Design a protein around this ligand. Structure first.
Ligand SMILES: [Zn+2]
Ligand SMILES: [Zn+2]
Lengths: 116, 98, 10, 214, 168, 287, 87, 217, 49
DNA sequence: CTCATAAATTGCAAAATG
RNA sequence: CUAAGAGUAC
DNA sequence: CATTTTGCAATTAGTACTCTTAGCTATGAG
């Protein structure tokens, strides 16, 4: 949703209707700091979330020994070795599709077929 | 089990001193925005600080435990996905040799 | 009730 | 207009179940009225505009000769249907006074959705007139045709006396059937009346039980 | 005998190959969930069914191989003691160890033991005991069978208590 | 061949069975049932080894189901009659601005999901915009009900210094550390609630501790010596108020410690649990 | 009692002695034989009171009557002589 | 099923869709709120085509500028016999004229539902700031309070093929296959009255429902 | 090949009572549990004194 | 110096409103 | 003698 | 006229064996 905070008192900013220009305008609720809105979006809700399935990837993810290795093609290095793990989205209905991190380029690529 | 032992507990002050010497960022001035990819160090469950290079810290802690400087009963865990470092020295823990 | 068999009520 | 079609189909099924109920009670209802098809019901009880009407849907039934011989204390019966979704005090009062002045001992009221609480209190009229409320939604499917449901036959006072004499029973020593059971409402049981239950047993071919209404 | 053991091993290998193919089709997302259940539920159902029919086929091969003079076969045929499953487990394959009706669970983080890499859904990693009692069990399979027997004992105690209360 | 490791109480060999318990100072999050208004509960069984050794169960609970739109996270502080909202605690410890609280709880700005789930808490606590106001709110909810309005603040400070997470520290000036730990607990609760992590396994053997003869005798002797020293203080107060002579032998009662230890070891009951001390089985060496 | 006692001419219960009736008849008769009751049958050397009672019942020489209680409290008197022991 | 259509698989599918309870939660991929100053042109280009049909086919001066946008699933519209028109009609019927609702066509690449709250003619100097929250509230109830199709207390339906003993006209008993419905959750009163099924032979594990619907016997 | 430690011996997973069982991997697990609980009832020499 | 006392079932009456 | 507790058999 | 909401303890396989410990603690006063 890309929320922002006030730069005067470090508090939240809320959307506000305008009349002279009929435009969205973000304002503070305790110091009345006023600025424009970058996007009309003000609230997002994910019934089905696609992000977060690859969360926790770190540049030294390969140092984890418990993480298994594979030799599937890397479509940025064409290298063999990489680390693979299933979806981190722990919902009971998630698909078992794997994800792969290359130890040379750190590009995350999955084993899906519909997306490709 | 035959080779399973139970820790008896040691004073965790030396480990805190080791962490502070080896670059443990104090928790008072820890601003997560400026150090997002930071690994949180736990000693006996007490969140003591964060480190920016947990790999070298774990390596030197392992070396010190392996050379006898740290009591071998001390258990050190590095959860890379959660980016956490957990050190347990209290009594009651059940371990086995490997 | 009780509990068991709070109160009623509370 | 699909909602109108499904509503009129449900109303036709409810009417068929009501006629079956009245015939089962012991009154003189012909089989032809029971087996009325959808198109005939649509032609008769629904207007040209397509909205079914209930004021001309209410009817009267009379006991057959067998019931009169077996039950020499029960007369004619009236079946009514409400039009508005919410039945008010005025309509229920008009129905009950119509029952009283037409000299009916039993009148089945059939409502669309519910009855106001202020109308339930005046539902029990002066005896021997009795008012029974049924929901059209609950009357879409006739429960008595289920294979689970056995055959229920109301007993006469003489038959109940003979039963209690032969089996040496008391009123409470009989198996009970609540005076709220869907079958008890269906056959119009009053408390104290015993029904005979014919069941297709698997150890003997036929088993006859008797349940007293409570 | 030797040919029968070879055929049993071939049956186990074929079942494991089918399980690997099912795992590929699930991981490649080409697997469709059966109506009324999720993808993981259908995948686990298929894996358990394949392993169960594998143990059944191996036991049937062993039972057919057993001559009429075989003493365990004689006891089973007489009906005094034993059954087909006992012959299957003693001679052909112990089978799939199940806890709570499911395969062995990931007690450790995403893995059953620290002797298996993360997210390993292969039959050996989740309690399948491909070794008969004649051949003996590997350490991991021994532990998984210990968990299964523990569940059996717990269920026995709970069931006798509950049945006593119900009977009273 | 005798191996030792057991006691001789009244000529009987008594062994102390290793008592299994949940580990202290570990945050555990559990999914709750659908009917209950709380969906997830994050708790710590905080305890400090080098202190009073008293258990304070801090719980962080997430009220409201998935279909509920008002999801307010509430914490169960000790000696508090109500589940205080977390933002009130955060502003009480000294973190007023919303951005600072959210940084102390959430670590990712792009993690807008956690921020969206956390917005009800800040919108609930918007009524308070001052540390003294939040401390006064807690003191008003304080169950002691024996503090004046101006000193409730101080009393709240005590609740937030010596009862809230004792395992961190018992001194003052470390409010930031306890605020960090509270934010970490709320973060764990949200991660368990956002389906990003599975609920902690209660049976995990690394989450359990076995009290051997050492810790068991340690806590038993702690209680028993507390008894003895309280008796010493009572005797000293009596003899100074009555101005009689003071003697050490007439003060100490060795029977206290001796009988307490001998009873707790002779009978399985470990106090004043059961079956802690059992007759050593001598039917077979392996037994 | 007169209202309770159903007359012999219209007893509606089974004329066959039940297993419980036979068990209690044998028990009572064996007990009486053990307590020196007179024997109405010739003895072929038997000495067990139970088998004595069985031999008495075989030729219907037991001077007892069953009073079968209906659930309503009414009772029927079936003499052991006219009961048929079939089981 | 009704004996006339015992083997009719498509009629069985029709019955399954007729009784299977469906909610927008299983259909809506996501929900959002946007600031559209005028209900004639939308700042989002992708959905613009939608309005340039609807506004052309059709009042608009009393609508709140906040717009509630729901993105649905194509596979959800596939496995279930649901279309954009059906759900749009459901929402319009359940919310009256107080919420102006538009939806893209089924063949469109993206399934979008756009809702706007009508503005009362009376001036409101405080609702405008809170209007957004009101929209949120509406969205919440719109996720669960309404039902597209099916009857209540029916979480899921499965269709099995059983095989019964039917007395053949020649005299013997034949193994006739039949399509049978198993339902998770029990709504016996509402399921039994659904047309197309056999009302006589319906049965339920929950004998409480049988007793309270069919009778003590 | 990413091992970090090695079991000193797998037979060390067993306890004191289950280390007496010969070929415990050739047994049904409830039988091993029965023998573990039953060897404590076994009769031998508990102490030489 | 020695006796006397410090899982799963159930089973609702409030209290508030418009 | 009573009570409590522990272990155990099927 | 119509909802509506809330807070928790007692009772829940049979028998059967063996052994171990403990029974108001300490202080006043006749
Ligand atoms: Zn501001
Ligand atoms: Zn690469």
């Amino acid at each position: 949703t890309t929320f922002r905070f006030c730069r005067d008192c470090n508090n939240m900013l809320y959307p506000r209707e305008d009349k002279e220009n009929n435009r969205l305008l973000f304002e503070c609720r305790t110091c009345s700091y006023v600025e424009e809105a970058g996007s009309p979006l003000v609230y997002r809700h994910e019934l089905i979330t696609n992000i977060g399935e690859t969360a926790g990837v770190v540049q030294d993810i390969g140092s984890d020994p418990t993480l298994p290795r594979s030799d599937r093609e890397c479509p940025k290095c064409h290298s063999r070795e990489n680390v693979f793990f299933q979806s981190q989205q722990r919902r009971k209905d998630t698909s078992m599709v794997l994800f792969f991190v290359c130890l040379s380029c750190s590009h995350i690529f999955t084993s899906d077929q519909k997306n490709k | 089990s035959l080779m399973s032992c139970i820790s008896v507990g040691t004073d965790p002050m030396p480990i805190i001193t080791f962490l502070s010497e080896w670059g443990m960022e104090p928790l008072e001035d820890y601003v997560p925005h400026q150090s997002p990819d930071a690994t949180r160090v736990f000693v006996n469950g007490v969140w003591h600080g964060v480190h920016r290079n947990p790999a070298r810290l774990m390596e030197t802690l392992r070396t010190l435990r392996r050379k006898g400087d740290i009591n071998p009963e001390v258990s050190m865990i590095r959860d890379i996905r959660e980016k956490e470092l957990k050190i347990f020295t209290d009594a009651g823990r059940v371990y086995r040799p490997l | 009730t009780x509990p068991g068999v709070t109160x009623p009520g509370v | 207009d699909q909602e109108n079609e499904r509503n009129i189909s449900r109303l036709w099924r409810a009417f068929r179940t009501v006629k079956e109920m009245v015939k089962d009670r012991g009154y003189f209802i012909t089989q032809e009225e029971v087996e009325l098809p959808l198109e005939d019901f649509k032609a008769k009880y629904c207007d040209s505009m397509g909205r079914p009407q209930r004021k001309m849907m209410s009817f009267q039934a009379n006991p057959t000769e067998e019931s009169i011989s077996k039950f020499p204390d029960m007369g004619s019966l009236w079946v009514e249907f409400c039009d508005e979704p919410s039945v008010g005090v005025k309509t229920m009062k008009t129905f009950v006074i119509h029952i009283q002045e037409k000299n009916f001992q039993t009148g089945i009221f059939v409502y669309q959705n519910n009855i106001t609480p202020s109308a339930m209190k005046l539902v029990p009229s002066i005896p021997p007139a009795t008012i029974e409320t049924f929901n059209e939604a609950a009357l879409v499917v006739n429960i008595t045709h289920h294979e689970l449901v056995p055959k229920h036959i109301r007993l006469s006072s003489d038959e109940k006396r003979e039963l209690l004499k032969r089996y040496r029973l008391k009123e409470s020593q009989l198996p009970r059937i609540q005076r709220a059971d869907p079958v008890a409402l269906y056959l119009g049981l009053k408390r104290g009346e015993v029904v005979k239950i014919i069941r297709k047993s698997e150890t003997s071919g036929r088993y006859a039980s008797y349940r007293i209404c409570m | 005998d030797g040919p029968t053991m070879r055929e049993i091993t071939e049956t186990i290998a074929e079942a494991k190959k089918k399980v690997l193919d099912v795992t590929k089709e699930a991981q490649a997302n080409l697997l469709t969930a059966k109506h009324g259940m999720t993808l993981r539920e259908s995948f686990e159902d298929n894996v358990v069914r394949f392993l169960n029919e594998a143990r059944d086929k191996a036991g049937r091969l062993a039972e057919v191989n057993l001559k009429d003079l075989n003493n365990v076969k004689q006891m089973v045929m007489a009906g005094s003691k034993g059954s087909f499953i006992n012959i299957a487990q003693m001679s052909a394959c112990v089978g799939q160890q199940s806890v709570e009706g499911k395969r062995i669970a990931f007690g450790f983080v995403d893995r059953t033991l620290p002797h298996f890499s993360k997210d390993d859904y292969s039959p050996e990693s989740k309690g399948f005991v491909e070794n008969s009692y004649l051949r003996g069990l590997t350490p991991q399979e021994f532990f998984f069978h210990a968990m299964g027997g523990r569940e059996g004992l717990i269920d026995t105690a709970v069931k006798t208590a509950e049945t006593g209360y119900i009977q009273r | 061949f005798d191996m030792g490791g057991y006691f001789i109480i009244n000529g009987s060999e008594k062994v102390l069975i290793a008592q299994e318990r949940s580990a202290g100072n570990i945050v555990q999050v559990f999914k709750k049932a659908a009917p209950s208004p709380i969906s997830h509960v994050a708790e710590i069984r905080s305890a400090l080894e080098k202190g009073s050794r008293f258990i304070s169960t801090l719980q962080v609970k997430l009220y409201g189901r998935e279909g509920s739109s008002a999801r307010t996270i509430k914490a169960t502080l000790p000696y508090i009659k109500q589940d205080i909202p977390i933002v009130i605690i955060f502003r009480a410890l000294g973190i007023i601005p919303d951005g600072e609280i959210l940084e102390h709880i959430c670590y990712d700005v792009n993690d807008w999901q956690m921020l969206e789930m956390l917005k009800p808490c800040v919108e609930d606590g918007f009524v308070i915009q001052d540390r003294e106001t939040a401390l006064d709110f807690i003191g008003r909810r304080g169950t002691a009900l024996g503090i004046k309005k101006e000193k409730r603040i101080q009393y709240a400070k005590d609740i937030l210094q010596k009862e809230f997470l004792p395992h961190i520290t018992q001194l003052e000036g470390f409010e930031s550390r306890k605020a960090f730990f509270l934010g970490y607990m709320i973060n764990r609760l949200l991660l368990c609630a956002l389906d990003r992590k599975d609920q902690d396994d209660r049976d995990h053997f690394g989450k359990k501790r076995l009290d051997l003869a050492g810790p068991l005798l340690a806590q038993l002797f702690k209680t028993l010596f507390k008894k003895l020293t309280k008796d010493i203080f009572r005797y000293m107060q009596r003899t100074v108020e009555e101005a009689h002579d003071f003697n050490m032998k007439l003060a100490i009662n060795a029977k206290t410690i001796t009988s307490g230890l001998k009873y707790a070891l002779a009978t399985g009951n470990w106090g004043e649990r059961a079956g802690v001390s059992q007759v050593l089985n001598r039917y077979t060496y392996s037994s | 009692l007169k209202e309770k006692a159903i007359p012999k001419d219209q007893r509606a219960t089974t004329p066959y002695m039940t297993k419980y009736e036979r068990a209690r008849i044998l028990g009572t008769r064996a007990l009486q034989i053990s307590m020196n009751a007179p024997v109405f049958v010739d003895l072929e050397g038997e000495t067990d009171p139970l088998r004595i009672a069985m031999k008495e019942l075989a030729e219907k020489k037991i001077p007892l009557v069953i009073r079968r209680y209906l659930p309503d409290g009414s009772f029927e008197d079936w003499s052991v002589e006219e009961l048929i022991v079939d089981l | 099923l009704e004996p006339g259509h015992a083997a009719d698989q498509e009629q069985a599918k029709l019955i399954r869709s007729a009784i299977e309870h469906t909610t927008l939660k299983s259909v809506t991929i996501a929900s959002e709120i946007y600031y559209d100053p005028d209900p004639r042109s939308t700042v989002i280009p992708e959905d613009e085509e939608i309005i340039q049909l609807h506004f052309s086919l059709l009042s608009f001066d009393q609508q709140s500028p906040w717009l509630l946008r729901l993105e649905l699933d194509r596979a959800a519209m596939n496995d279930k016999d649901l279309t954009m028109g059906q759900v749009g009609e459901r929402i319009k019927q359940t919310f009256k004229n107080d919420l102006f609702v538009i939806w893209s066509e089924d063949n469109d690449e993206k399934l979008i539902i756009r809702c706007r709250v009508v503005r009362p003619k009376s001036l409101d100097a405080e609702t405008e700031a809170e209007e957004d929250h009101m929209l949120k509230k509406i969205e919440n109830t719109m996720l669960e309070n309404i039902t597209l199709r099916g009857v209540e207390n029916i979480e899921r339906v499965v269709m099995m093929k059983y095989d019964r003993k039917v007395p053949s006209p020649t005299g013997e008993y034949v193994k006739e296959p039949e399509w049978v419905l198993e339902t998770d959750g029990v709504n016996l009163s509402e399921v039994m009255t659904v047309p197309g099924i056999d009302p006589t032979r319906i049965y339920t594990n929950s004998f409480i429902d049988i007793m309270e619907v069919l009778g003590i016997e | 090949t990413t091992f970090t430690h090695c079991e000193i011996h797998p037979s060390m997973i067993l306890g004191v009572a289950a280390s007496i069982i010969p070929f415990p991997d050739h047994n049904q697990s409830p039988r091993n549990t029965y023998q573990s609980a039953m060897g404590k009832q076994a009769m031998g020499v508990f102490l030489t004194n």
